[PDB]
């Protein structure tokens, strides 16, 4: 329906003053145990502090700056046929897209603590050096190249 959100407001991180670090713990946490996620955020930043050339205060933002697309491909029905169309990636999602991919990667991993599973993906999330890892972005590379019918 129509008379719906939008985006509900969230309160920014009390220690860092950031709304990205507030959304990050909300999607990172599991079974609503946000208190454990508050021990994983910044604890996963241990090996990134000196390695960040934007300084520590952008050592996580850098992994979200790596990917900021304008369109994504979707496969949608027009009748008895189903075709690939480009849909807009708005400012509200443009900064939260890669954040959602990094937590999935860490949850799908199974070695060390969670604060080390998260650090494995975050170490390469602005380097992209691994094999078959940029297949992640084919859903936006196929969108900046959509032809469809007009």
């Amino acid at each position: 329906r129509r008379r719906v959100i939008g985006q509900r407001k969230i309160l920014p991180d009390p220690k860092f003053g950031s709304e990205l670090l507030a959304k990050f713990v909300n999607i990172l946490m599991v079974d609503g145990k946000k208190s454990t996620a508050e021990s994983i955020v910044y604890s996963a930043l241990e090996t990134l502090a000196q390695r960040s050339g934007k300084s520590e205060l952008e050592a996580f933002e850098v992994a979200l700056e790596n990917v900021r697309p304008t369109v994504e491909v979707k496969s949608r029905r027009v009748g008895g046929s189903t075709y690939q169309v480009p849909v807009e990636v708005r400012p509200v999602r443009r900064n939260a897209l890669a954040m959602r991919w990094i937590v999935e990667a860490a949850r799908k991993r199974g070695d060390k603590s969670m604060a080390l599973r998260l650090a494995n993906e975050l170490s390469d999330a602005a380097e992209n050096k691994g094999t078959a890892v940029k297949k992640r972005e084919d859903v936006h590379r196929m969108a900046e190249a959509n032809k469809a019918f007009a």
Binding site: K147, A148, F149, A150
Partner: protein, 117 residues
């Protein structure tokens, strides 16, 4: 071998197909491309990009001839004509005359009796 600067282009654009061929003043074809050969099929073979990728390759197929001045003969009802002519004018060619020559039935041979669309 030797540049001419002048030619005549034959474009067919239908709701199911797009064909682009470039000829000289006497009807000798200097380059030819098809949207099927540019990797588009079915109804999508009529699309403004499927036409562009064939028009660009047909202009590239006359790149040895140094074309600058053009007259155009257009066939078929398909909307791709203005975007095709632009995708070809993007090769540096100026189009000084456009003429439609579609076989919209005059026609010869048997008249069809089935219905349309």
């Amino acid at each position: 071998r030797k540049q001419v600067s002048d030619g005549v282009a034959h474009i067919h654009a239908s709701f199911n197909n797009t064909i682009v061929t470039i000829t000289d003043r006497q009807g000798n074809a200097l380059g030819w491309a098809t949207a099927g050969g540019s990797g588009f099929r079915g109804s999508r073979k009529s699309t403004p990009f499927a036409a562009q990728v064939a028009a660009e390759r047909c202009a590239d197929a006359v790149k040895e001839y140094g074309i600058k001045n053009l007259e155009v003969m257009v066939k078929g009802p398909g909307p791709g004509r203005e975007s095709t002519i632009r995708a070809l004018n993007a090769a540096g060619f100026r189009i000084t005359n456009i003429t439609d020559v579609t076989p919209i039935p005059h026609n010869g041979c048997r008249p069809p009796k089935k219905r349309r669309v």
